[PDB]
Amino acid sequence: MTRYQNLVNGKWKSSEQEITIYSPINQEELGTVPAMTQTEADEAMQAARAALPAWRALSAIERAAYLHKTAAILERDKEKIGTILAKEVAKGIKAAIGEVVRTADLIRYAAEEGLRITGQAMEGGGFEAASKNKLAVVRREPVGIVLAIAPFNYPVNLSASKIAPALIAGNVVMLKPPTQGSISGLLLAKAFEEAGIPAGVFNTITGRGSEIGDYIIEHKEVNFINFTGSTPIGERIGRLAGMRPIMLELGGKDAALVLEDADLEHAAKQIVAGAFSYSGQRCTAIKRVIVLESVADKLATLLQEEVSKLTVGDPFDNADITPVIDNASADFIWGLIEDAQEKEAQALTPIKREGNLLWPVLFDQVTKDMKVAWEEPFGPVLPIIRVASVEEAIAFANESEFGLQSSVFTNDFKKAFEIAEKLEVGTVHINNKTQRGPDNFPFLGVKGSGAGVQGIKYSIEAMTNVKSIVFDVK
Amino acid sequence: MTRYQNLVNGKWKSSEQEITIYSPINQEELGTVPAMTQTEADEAMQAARAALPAWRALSAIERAAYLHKTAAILERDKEKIGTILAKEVAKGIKAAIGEVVRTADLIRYAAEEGLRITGQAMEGGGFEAASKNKLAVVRREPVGIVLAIAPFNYPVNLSASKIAPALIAGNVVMLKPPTQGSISGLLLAKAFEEAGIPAGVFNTITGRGSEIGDYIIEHKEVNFINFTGSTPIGERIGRLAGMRPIMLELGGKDAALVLEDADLEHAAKQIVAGAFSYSGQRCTAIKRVIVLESVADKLATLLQEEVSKLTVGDPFDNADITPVIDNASADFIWGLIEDAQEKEAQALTPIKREGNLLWPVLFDQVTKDMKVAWEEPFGPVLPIIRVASVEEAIAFANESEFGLQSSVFTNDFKKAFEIAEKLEVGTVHINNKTQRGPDNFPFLGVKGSGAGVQGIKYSIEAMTNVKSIVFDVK
Amino acid sequence: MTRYQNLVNGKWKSSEQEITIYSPINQEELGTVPAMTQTEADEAMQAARAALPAWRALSAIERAAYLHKTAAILERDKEKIGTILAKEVAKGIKAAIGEVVRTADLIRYAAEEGLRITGQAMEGGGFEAASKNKLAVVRREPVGIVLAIAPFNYPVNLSASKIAPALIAGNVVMLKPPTQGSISGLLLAKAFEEAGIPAGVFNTITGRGSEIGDYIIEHKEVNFINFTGSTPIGERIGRLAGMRPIMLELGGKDAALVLEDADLEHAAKQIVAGAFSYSGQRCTAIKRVIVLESVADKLATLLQEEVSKLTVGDPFDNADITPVIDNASADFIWGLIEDAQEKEAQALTPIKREGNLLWPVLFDQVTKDMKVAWEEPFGPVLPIIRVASVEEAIAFANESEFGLQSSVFTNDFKKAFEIAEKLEVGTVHINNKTQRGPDNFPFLGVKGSGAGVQGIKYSIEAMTNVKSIVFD
Amino acid sequence: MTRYQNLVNGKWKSSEQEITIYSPINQEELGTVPAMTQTEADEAMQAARAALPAWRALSAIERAAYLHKTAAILERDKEKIGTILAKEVAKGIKAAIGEVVRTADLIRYAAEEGLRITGQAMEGGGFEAASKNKLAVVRREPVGIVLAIAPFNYPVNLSASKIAPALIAGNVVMLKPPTQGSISGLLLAKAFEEAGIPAGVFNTITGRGSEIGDYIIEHKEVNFINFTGSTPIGERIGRLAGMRPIMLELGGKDAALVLEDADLEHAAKQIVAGAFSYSGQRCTAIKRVIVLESVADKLATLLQEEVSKLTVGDPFDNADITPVIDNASADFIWGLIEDAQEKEAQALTPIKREGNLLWPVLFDQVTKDMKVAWEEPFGPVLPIIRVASVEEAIAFANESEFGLQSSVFTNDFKKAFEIAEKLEVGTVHINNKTQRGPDNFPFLGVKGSGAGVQGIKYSIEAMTNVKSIVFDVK
Ligand SMILES: NC(=O)c1ccc[n+]([C@@H]2O[C@H](COP(=O)([O-])OP(=O)(O)OC[C@H]3O[C@@H](n4cnc5c(N)ncnc54)[C@H](OP(=O)(O)O)[C@@H]3O)[C@@H](O)[C@H]2O)c1
Ligand SMILES: NC(=O)c1ccc[n+]([C@@H]2O[C@H](COP(=O)([O-])OP(=O)(O)OC[C@H]3O[C@@H](n4cnc5c(N)ncnc54)[C@H](OP(=O)(O)O)[C@@H]3O)[C@@H](O)[C@H]2O)c1
Ligand SMILES: NC(=O)c1ccc[n+]([C@@H]2O[C@H](COP(=O)([O-])OP(=O)(O)OC[C@H]3O[C@@H](n4cnc5c(N)ncnc54)[C@H](OP(=O)(O)O)[C@@H]3O)[C@@H](O)[C@H]2O)c1
């Protein structure tokens, strides 16, 4: 019933074509988002380019006032936004409200962090005596139009993590929310417009990525692409962008290296909390357990009982395991489970499917040959791999096509640091589950898990151009 | 006569196919460089990948010792290297020796700057109280194999500006010197090998870029591409690299905005020194003069007499204007001159050509329609454009397809700063000619003049991966 | 009538001895502040030392929540606080309310700036190969108890500029507001307590500095002294503190170097705005005009007419020139004026006194021998000095016993930068009046104008101890 | 026999009064240093003040060239300087040569670190919108004349650690070497003058600190006091300096907190290596062992055998334990030993004295009441204290009048970090002996162990004044 519209040039626009959004919980029609045509995307880019000069000419504090007001409105409407978000991405209702609250906190932190970007005043005298009187005043300037593309699992938090760092830096933002999540992206736009953001400073583009995505990625006006999504689409986007700056937050098959001298109870608690949070539908989540021979059986028992503790059901009952986003994802996860069963994997938990609602599957005795050891199921499946030495554990963790994060569970932290710089990942957590963590911490992946460093400071700095001004002081 | 070989795995290798290098001065055969096949490039990448672990496992100071020894050997052999460099790229002999000396100084500065890369120790308590006990130890780690590709005009200095920042960071370097300049790149390799660099840490790939370039750009092992060259090739490289990190230092049509309240004598001296240094064959050089109506005639007179002061002839006579690199470049520059003459441009200096040896041409009354106003001639041609206001000057400077650098000549520095952040360039020089400057200063271009920030600190940092290690301090 | 009490250990305490506060405007009794005894100061230090562990154990964000709430309460009560502040330091009422608003903004900025203090993770491999496997995790930790002592002219803003950077860093603060200004300091404490600051985290000590000041400066518990005041007291405090860390923001005789190629109208506007703001009772204010021979007459004419534009009267009429703080300050300023008149200084403006209410005096033809050329009058007097060259201008600016700030007025900014690093000051303003500026900018003096670098980032960092943790 | 002279105004000056230097080894006359009068100190300050402008007007790289030449000359003359240093402070000959080598390396690192001091370019727009157009160019400028005062144990290394960071920053240095060590300070001056340092840039003041020290501390010209010495003199200096900036590196009674889950063999090796290096005559050395009840006996046995391994004798035989500096120090250490024996301390090693040559004494069962538990013996005595809990260990470590450094020996590094921020010291070493470490690491003490942060970067920055230049960018 409810018509949703895109924020273009500060006013709400509908489109001729439309996409109907169905709840993953029970196929309930939640609304309709506009399927913008190519010319409407051109008009939205026009508006952003026209609004860029006045936005960039504001003070940093005047720019941050809008972000603070947006955060206040998000906090005020957290219940409604979280309810619709829970209905739309099959997220736990209280977890969805928590996502809205963390989004507000991220917007506030980004607003207050973009006020303190300090440049440099370099002297040439340290490099050569001929240049002793040269002073370079190095500062940061907006790249221009930032195109933010968000994934389904966090269409509010991972949209704001691109919008707020871009907006406080002086850029104007073009938001492309995921189709299953476009309602939540348009509610974030609802809040941004209610906060009084100037017309054209923040715009939304809704539509299928398979049809509108390439046009807006290759667009003339886009000066920066901040994309969070699957590796197949991230590779295509980084290949289509060419020379323009990009951030990619792609897939990740994060490992949990459990060593012999590890607190197996804490390790199991952390691994299950990270692995099966939001039905395994976080990309920064333990997707592999690489455990040595000695402690493998005890860790498998503890992991299996912890997975057995998980509640599986409706998002509004705050179930730990909720339905996966759509039927195709469930089919892919089921195919990985079937492959693992084919190759004699010890299923440590019941394997039941009720359509989208898959039950948490813990696999033991996983080898190289099962696709679940490599492919990111992006669902409630956790393979347990047994290795003989720390060298084999590091080798197996590094054979992945992914480098987002990893976690090392051990008591000797000197060995944990050694493994940490031997691991080809962007972040290593010692005795803790992998997570994006405090959003001031750097967040990056390396080997096909991304391209660029993000986190609030790093994303604010990376969506800006350095401009040096060199003059003579004597 | 003289056979030259590529440094592969610490030993010198020749190839079946060969490229003969002819002096641009008089078509003198200077030697032969190997035209490496695809499998030889594979072997060189193999060697770099194998040598990466031991190189990265060294101390920063042990790594910098090799760079200091290389700089000492370069200083020792500056006369021979500069003589062959002057013969090979038709550079002034004393200017070539100066390039070798600046290369040694750059290697020393990069070696001493990579010793001081300090990480961060971040706390989560400022973002959220739940994470008050989290500590992220953020540091830098090598990307891996850095593929450096150099242009002809500075095959030693712009090779070392990619090698030394990469080597001190812990990366291994694959050098692709330009074919007209490969001899000088192999002499830089000569010095690097004599300094005792470990086998496989620094390798060279010689051959035509049109045939070996795409293979090594798209190679499996290359973890970073540092390319300096023309914009057409830089766009292709940034498009072929896809998701891998790149630096591009592409073309630049730098402008010299001369305002009414400017020191026209100093402005003219600086503009001619920057524009016609090395026959206009520097990319960071004044290629446009955008001068207001009031001072245009006086500036044109001063510029024309300064260009008339220039000596045109042999590189070993230290002529200000030397032969351009090859016949194709001379033909392109001549075509631009012919277009300007077609469209009624006031040639302020004699227009004579003796093959590669073109004479400095100063054009006045240049409009939008002449290709010399837009295309980078990369030669001894300097168009003078007249505009009516500062707004038109800024608009015309920003209409270019390039954003490397610009210089603003005026006496009111407050207006100079205003213009400086209105200019869509990477660096603005106030009352000075554009230059790469002290190599600690940031050097970047924006609008198709590059992708990334370079300069010794920035290039050291940008050829490294961030690695965060997060643990509990409780 | 109104009894005021000190915030000690989160509860309000009165003292046996008392100080009565009289309005500099009309000697109106504004209230009474407690004259704390030595043992009461000991008890307050006890409370701060006891509250330090729990305060330091909070998150930075939990600590900043209290500062944000304090800023909100200050914004809410700006009218009342500014009214009492205007009555108490004879500041313009709208200027006083503006001071309260800037105080709230400073508290907010310090709270949000102390959340982002990031340490370092250093490696030993760049220094020596033997230490390639050593990692130093360098971070910041509170010094402990910070003793903040404020001057009269900004008893709210210059109190918060020491409290908020100290509180967000994890320190507990002992505030000593000026006696003429202690009411405003206790209103700032009123707001800090209403915001819910934990008991003992923020305490106030009221009393005469001449009697309680040395005891609390030399106290056992004080781990840091942040003092803003006159140079004679700052020298004594830096000498009594001994080895403990200190910040001093002492006197400053800031100069306005006006060169020949200068915009004399803009220069005169800026010089008069800086020099006679709050009756010259700001320490970061133009107190000297050093102008070359060529433009001296034009600059003197423009300066004299700008000073003639100034309104002199009641603070609640928002007069540009208000009564000076007390009779002793007026006597000192009058003595400097009398010396200048003795030595044949061209008084360019009327010289009238109505007790505390002095009228803005612009002096020309000032030489070395007049005390107004050197001594900080801290009042509405602006000497104009004429020099023959830029070298003499720089020399005369550097002969001062002060190094707070200076301003260079010229059109050639390359020459302005040259003069700027030839000037022995902490900050040089080019074509602008001297000011503390945006409180993120560094603020320091050098040659007896202070000791240390302040400004929100620098004050947050300088009230903390570095702690390195080195492991393999 | 050999007359030594002070470097004043670039030329060598003798004094009427003289101090004879006697070797602590065998009371051998090593030479005579001038006992400068007050007027000679005035003349030296005059020379420094006169040479300050030209020194400060040099390029940073021109300033660093002199430091590099000084380091080269020190490396060249390391054998002679180390021989005289070993004779003069009774240091091991090979240890003394190692000190000279580390001094050269410190001078080189400080020279290359002072070239890279980069300022800031701050904008007012983040604080208030009214100041959006203000730019502060914040940089560092020399304080002026730096008065460096060195202690006896490292009269070369701890002199250069004040001279090189001061000289590279643009300051001129007034060196006051210790009387027992003034010969080595004048040899460091020998090298500085041979390197060609400009006249008056580096001067030396020799004489008794008890007579010339207060005059030069309270001097008019001294703009900064960098003092390393005992706490009684440091308190006096910080009290006499008043408002002028100071660094103090005072005494330190560093503790070695050994917990139950600790590697007692490694802990004992590290504790004995730190505690008895140079006869306990380093200030950053383990002077207390605070060990829990459980592992106290095993740690005491291991410590006692490690101390029994130590060789006691002549410095030129490279003995681990060498004679203490003078008879008064030996008497003080003997008094502390006698007090410990009085109060029933278990002397775990032989207690023998041959004048200055004391033998390493390891005390067990040490309580609060023995002066050796609190007073810094500054000699070959190591008390072992037993405590019941970690809380008592932290309390006893914090009851000291000193806060230089401490070391925590344990296997659980999370507990080690917890103790580390509970310890009221400047540096905590985890599973390692305390040391000044790599001289890039910060070095500071807190509770009467100093005032200020030192280490090469921190000492370079702290001997400079911040200067902000604020202008309008429009
Ligand atoms: N590392 C991280 O920070 C992080 C965090 C969370 C998730 N992820 C990743 O996100 C993925 C799941 O999200 P998803 O499946 O929704 O992402 P996806 O299908 O790969 O695409 C992500 C976003 O890009 C749009 N898109 C799709 N095709 C496109 C094209 N050809 N051109 C341009 N844009 C296009 C999508 O819109 P439509 O699909 O709605 O058309 C969606 O909004 C997982 O692979 C996970 O690894 C990464
Ligand atoms: N650079 C800056 O940032 C800055 C800014 C504003 C003002 N100032 C300076 O502030 C001065 C005017 O303030 P003022 O005259 O009120 O300051 P003051 O009399 O010199 O003393 C300043 C503060 O210290 C207290 N005090 C007085 N004697 C003391 C002692 N013996 N020991 C410890 N504390 C003592 C005072 O309290 P009581 O006097 O109430 O007892 C007052 O709160 C001017 O000289 C001006 O230069 C500097
Ligand atoms: N934390 C560190 O970095 C560190 C490192 C090493 C040593 N230390 C400390 O150094 C001390 C041992 O050295 P020391 O006994 O030679 O030092 P000291 O006697 O306390 O004095 C240190 C230096 O100051 C001079 N001096 C003496 N009296 C003075 C006065 N009244 N005014 C000014 N200067 C004066 C001394 O010269 P003369 O004595 O020759 O006259 C000597 O050069 C120990 O207490 C140790 O804790 C600290």
User: How many other CB atoms are found less than 10 A from the CB of residue B391?
Assistant: 10
Considering only CA atoms, which of C304, C295, C302 is closest in space to residue C393? Answer: C295
Burial class of B68 by CB neighbour count within 10 A (0 to 12, 13 to 18, 19+): middle
D330 three-state secondary structure: helix
Cα–Cα distance for residue pair B365/B372, rounded to 1 Å: 12
Cα–Cα distance for residue pair B7/B48, rounded to 1 Å: 11
Q: Select from B60, B138, B431 the Cβ nearest to the Cβ of C126.
A: B60
Residue to mutate (ligand 2; options C279, C283, C439, C454; most atoms within 8 A of CB): C283
Q: Does D411 touch chain A (CB under 8 A)?
A: yes
Half-sphere exposure at residue C381, Cβ-oriented, CA atoms within 13 angstroms = 36
Cα–Cα distance for residue pair D206/D13, rounded to 1 Å: 11
For residue A49, the distance in angstroms to the closest alpha carbon of chain B comes to 15
Where in the sequence numbering do the catalytic residues of A fall? 249
With a 6 A CB cut-off, is C88 part of the ligand 2 pocket? no
Burial class of B260 by CB neighbour count within 10 A (0 to 12, 13 to 18, 19+): middle
For residue C363, the distance in angstroms to the closest alpha carbon of chain A comes to 34
Half-sphere exposure at residue D123, Cβ-oriented, CA atoms within 13 angstroms = 23
Mutate to test the interface with D, among A56, A112, A118 (most CBs of D within 10 A): A118
Identity of residue C79: E
**Chain A environment of B448 (Cβ under 8 Å):** 243
Considering only CA atoms, which of D152, D154, D174, D187 is closest in space to residue D33? Answer: D187
DSSP of A35-73: ---HHHHHHHHHHHHHHHHHHHTS-HHHHHHHHHHHHHH
Q: Which residues pair with D453 in a beta bridge?
A: D444
Report CA torsion sign: A24, A28, A32, A37: positive
H helices of A180-295, in order, are 182-194, 214-217, 231-241, 264-275
Considering only CA atoms, which of D233, D172, D245 is closest in space to residue D204? Answer: D172
Distance D383 CA to ligand 3 centre (A): 24
Closest-CA residue of chain D to B420: D473
**Chain D environment of A119 (Cβ under 8 Å):** 120-123
Q: Are D154 and D101 in contact (CB under 8 A)?
A: no
Burial class of D381 by CB neighbour count within 10 A (0 to 12, 13 to 18, 19+): buried
Q: Are A422 and A390 in contact (CB under 8 A)?
A: no
Cα–Cα distance for residue pair A238/D214, rounded to 1 Å: 68
Q: Select from C439, C448, C470 the Cβ nearest to the Cβ of D437.
A: C470
Residues 68-97 of D with CB under 8 A from C: none
Considering only CA atoms, which of D149, D148, D155 is closest in space to residue D24? Answer: D155
Q: Does A220 touch chain C (CB under 8 A)?
A: no
* CB within 8 Å of D201: residues ≥ 6 apart: D10, D48, D51, D55, D167, D172, D173
φ and ψ of C81, to 5 deg: -65, -40
Closest-CA residue of chain D to A112: D126
Q: Are B428 and B406 in contact (CB under 8 A)?
A: yes
Identity of residue B204: T
Scan for tokens 């308590």, then name that residue: B125
φ and ψ of B143, to 5 deg: -70, -30
Cα–Cα distance for residue pair B345/D201, rounded to 1 Å: 59
State the resolution, in angstroms.
Answer: 2.8
Cα–Cα distance for residue pair A74/C285, rounded to 1 Å: 45
Q: Solved by what technique?
A: cryo-EM
**Chain A environment of B438 (Cβ under 8 Å):** 122, 124, 126-128, 131, 134
How far, in Å, are A146, A410, C66, D104, D246 from residue A65 at the CA level?
A: 20, 45, 20, 54, 43
* CB within 8 Å of B116: residues ≥ 6 apart: C126, D113, D116, D440
**Chain A environment of B395 (Cβ under 8 Å):** none
Q: Does B471 touch chain D (CB under 8 A)?
A: yes
The region, left, alpha or beta by phi > 0 then psi within -120 to 50, assigned to residue A339 is alpha
Residues 114-173 of C with CB under 8 A from B: 114-123, 125-129, 132, 135, 137-139
Considering only CA atoms, which of B199, A415, D286 is closest in space to residue C133? Answer: A415
Q: Which protein residue has the closest C-alpha to ligand 2 atom 20?
A: C230
Q: Which residues pair with A468 in a beta bridge?
A: A138, B427
Q: Please report the beta strands in B221-379, taking only residues with DSSP state E, as ranges in sequence order.
A: 222-228, 246-249, 254-258, 286-292, 346-347, 353-354, 357-358, 361-364
* CB within 8 Å of B159: residues ≥ 6 apart: B148, B150, B175, B177, B184, B185, B188
Q: Does A235 touch chain B (CB under 8 A)?
A: yes
Scored b (16 or more CB within 10 A) or e, D201-226 reads bbbbbbbebeebbeebbebebbbbbb
Q: Which chains touch C (3 or more CB pairs under 8 A)?
A: A, B, D
Mutate to test the interface with A, among D61, D141, D410 (most CBs of A within 10 A): D61
Cα–Cα distance for residue pair B326/B180, rounded to 1 Å: 9
Tell me which H or E stretch contains C80. Answer: helix C78-89
Q: Which chains touch D (3 or more CB pairs under 8 A)?
A: A, B, C
Cα-based torsion angle of the residue sequence A44, A48, A49, A55 in order, rounded to the nearest 10 degrees: 170
Q: Are B301 and B293 in contact (CB under 8 A)?
A: no
Closest-CA residue of chain A to D130: A59
Identity of residue B266: H
* CB within 8 Å of B20: residues ≥ 6 apart: B29, B31, B32
φ and ψ of A321, to 5 deg: -110, 120
For residue C414, the distance in angstroms to the closest alpha carbon of chain A comes to 6
With a 6 A CB cut-off, is C183 part of the ligand 2 pocket? no
φ and ψ of B122, to 5 deg: -95, 150
> Which tokens in the block code for residue C74?
């200050």
How far, in Å, are C74, C150, C204 from residue C184 at the CA level?
A: 11, 11, 12
Q: Taking CA B154 as the corner, what is the angle to CA B148 and CA B160, rounded to the nearest 5 degrees?
A: 45
How far, in Å, are A471, B251, B411, B431 from residue C414 at the CA level?
A: 9, 31, 9, 10
Q: Are D198 and D172 in contact (CB under 8 A)?
A: no
Q: Are C165 and C194 in contact (CB under 8 A)?
A: no
**Chain D environment of A125 (Cβ under 8 Å):** 59-61, 115
φ and ψ of B182, to 5 deg: -65, -30
**Chain A environment of D66 (Cβ under 8 Å):** none
Instruction: Check CB contact under 8 Å for C125 and B61.
Output: yes
Cα–Cα distance for residue pair B444/B454, rounded to 1 Å: 6
Q: Are D247 and D225 in contact (CB under 8 A)?
A: yes
How far, in Å, are B143, B436, D214 from residue D236 at the CA level?
A: 53, 52, 9
Residue to mutate (ligand 3; options D19, D102, D153, D405; most atoms within 8 A of CB): D153
For residue C389, the distance in angstroms to the closest alpha carbon of chain B comes to 22
Q: Which residues pair with B364 in a beta bridge?
A: B346
User: How many other CB atoms are found less than 10 A from the CB of residue B101?
Assistant: 16
With a 6 A CB cut-off, is D185 part of the ligand 3 pocket? no
Considering only CA atoms, which of D274, D420, D272, D264 is closest in space to residue C471? Answer: D420
Report CA torsion sign: B306, B307, B313, B319: positive
* CB within 8 Å of C50: residues ≥ 6 apart: C200
With a 6 A CB cut-off, is A209 part of the ligand 1 pocket? yes
Q: Counting atoms of ligand 1 from 1, which one is nearest the CA of A436?
A: 3
Sheet containing strand C450-451, edge to edge, reads C202-204, C172-176, C145-149, C222-228, C246-249, C450-451
Please give the domain boundaries of chain B with CATH numbers for all domains.
6-250+450-470 (3.40.605.10), 254-438 (3.40.309.10)
For chain B, the residues before each gap (C–N > 2.5 Å) are none
Q: Select from C105, C441, C468 the Cβ nearest to the Cβ of D427.
A: C468
Where in the sequence numbering do the catalytic residues of D fall? 249
* CB within 8 Å of C464: residues ≥ 6 apart: C117, C140, C141, C142, C143, C169, C170, C171
Report CA torsion sign: B264, B266, B268, B274: negative
Mutate to test the interface with C, among B55, B56, B58, B59 (most CBs of C within 10 A): B59
Q: Does D441 touch chain B (CB under 8 A)?
A: no
Q: Does D59 touch chain B (CB under 8 A)?
A: no
User: How many other CB atoms are found less than 10 A from the CB of residue A14?
Assistant: 14
Q: What one-character DSSP code corresponds to residue C368?
A: T
Cα–Cα distance for residue pair B45/B400, rounded to 1 Å: 38
Cα–Cα distance for residue pair A451/B245, rounded to 1 Å: 7
With a 6 A CB cut-off, is A213 part of the ligand 1 pocket? yes
Q: Which protein residue has the closest C-alpha to ligand 1 atom 35?
A: A209
Closest-CA residue of chain D to B422: D474
Cα–Cα distance for residue pair B258/B298, rounded to 1 Å: 11
Distance C228 CA to ligand 2 centre (A): 6
Cα–Cα distance for residue pair A113/A168, rounded to 1 Å: 8
Q: Rg of chain D's alpha carbons, rounded to an integer? A: 23
User: How many other CB atoms are found less than 10 A from the CB of residue A94?
Assistant: 13
Q: Are B127 and A440 in contact (CB under 8 A)?
A: yes
> Which tokens in the block code for residue C94?
């709208």
> Which tokens in the block code for residue C337?
């004026």
Residues 245-284 of D with CB under 8 A from C: 245, 248
Task: Note the Cα A208 to chain centre separation in Å.
Answer: 19
Cα–Cα distance for residue pair B225/D222, rounded to 1 Å: 53
Cα–Cα distance for residue pair C86/D107, rounded to 1 Å: 57
Q: Does B101 touch chain A (CB under 8 A)?
A: no
Distance A229 CA to ligand 1 centre (A): 3
Cα–Cα distance for residue pair D111/D62, rounded to 1 Å: 10
The region, left, alpha or beta by phi > 0 then psi within -120 to 50, assigned to residue C331 is alpha
Tell me which H or E stretch contains C226. Answer: strand C222-228
φ and ψ of C170, to 5 deg: 105, 0
Cα–Cα distance for residue pair C247/C452, rounded to 1 Å: 5
Cα–Cα distance for residue pair A408/D258, rounded to 1 Å: 26
Q: Are A459 and A444 in contact (CB under 8 A)?
A: no
Q: Are C224 and C146 in contact (CB under 8 A)?
A: yes
DSSP of B70-98: HHHHHHHTHHHHHHHHHHHH---HHHHHH
* CB within 8 Å of C210: residues ≥ 6 apart: none
